Design a protein around this nucleic acid. Structure first.
Ligand SMILES: [Zn+2]
Ligand SMILES: [Zn+2]
Lengths: 127, 142
RNA sequence: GCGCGCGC
RNA sequence: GCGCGCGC
């Protein structure tokens, strides 16, 4: 396990640095989203939204998110209680750590702790 | 419900929608993995030279590179090196099925409107073993 | 789409 | 990275 400040995020395909492990938060203790507003500069969002045959209480899908540099698909946009959040697939984010680059197979098993998303907190850091 | 002849189902990349294959070229490995056995199918996809990692050893096969549309780069699945033979393994959701009744995107191979037969290694080998007598300039050719 | 389990 | 199941 590494302190989260020592873990950076890179696109698994083109390997450009696109984020920081410290910007990740969990939604419903499962989905991992990046809450840093500067992260938006590293991905594109598809015109049409992802179609899901189910209705969720607090969120609805937005478009597909992909690396702005190479087009690699990273996951999708989650519109949580009206707030847009990029949900990342763990395999899409190559981890840059003190022991080298690591490709994790499950968010629940990455070598660092991630805090649960807190809406109130998110509003503080962004208003 | 209705089941279509496999020759009447074409495969298109769910993304760019280019016609890449035919339903008749699919076979099931272990009754689950769906591979395309048409050698000419190779021309429609790319393979990353960095094999997929799986922390499990399989008796008859090992993972190969990640496969994707040679046209748009959409990921289709992974290469399977079965008893030394490379077979492209396709996830159903990455394929768009063009049937006699419009295009259809299934979400599970176990529910497509056609029957995919089992892969047979010996058959595959025979079909692909070089018969030099077939070449006009070979001394065995009649 | 994203997650978890199991299998391969 | 595929399959099956469930969850979101
Ligand atoms: Zn990239
Ligand atoms: Zn394509």
């Amino acid at each position: 396990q590494f302190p989260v400040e020592h873990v950076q995020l890179l696109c698994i395909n083109c390997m450009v640095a696109v984020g920081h492990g410290s910007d990740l938060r969990k939604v419903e203790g499962t989905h991992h989203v990046n809450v840093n507003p500067n992260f938006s500069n590293y991905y594109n969002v598809s015109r049409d939204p992802v179609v899901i045959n189910k209705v969720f209480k607090d969120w609805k899908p937005g478009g597909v998110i992909s690396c702005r540099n190479c087009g690699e698909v990273w996951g999708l946009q989650m519109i949580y209680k009206s707030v847009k959040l990029p949900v990342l697939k763990v395999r899409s984010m190559l981890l840059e750590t003190p022991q080298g680059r690591i490709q994790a197979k499950k968010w629940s098993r990455v070598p660092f702790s991630v805090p649960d998303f807190d809406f109130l907190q998110h509003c503080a850091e962004n208003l």
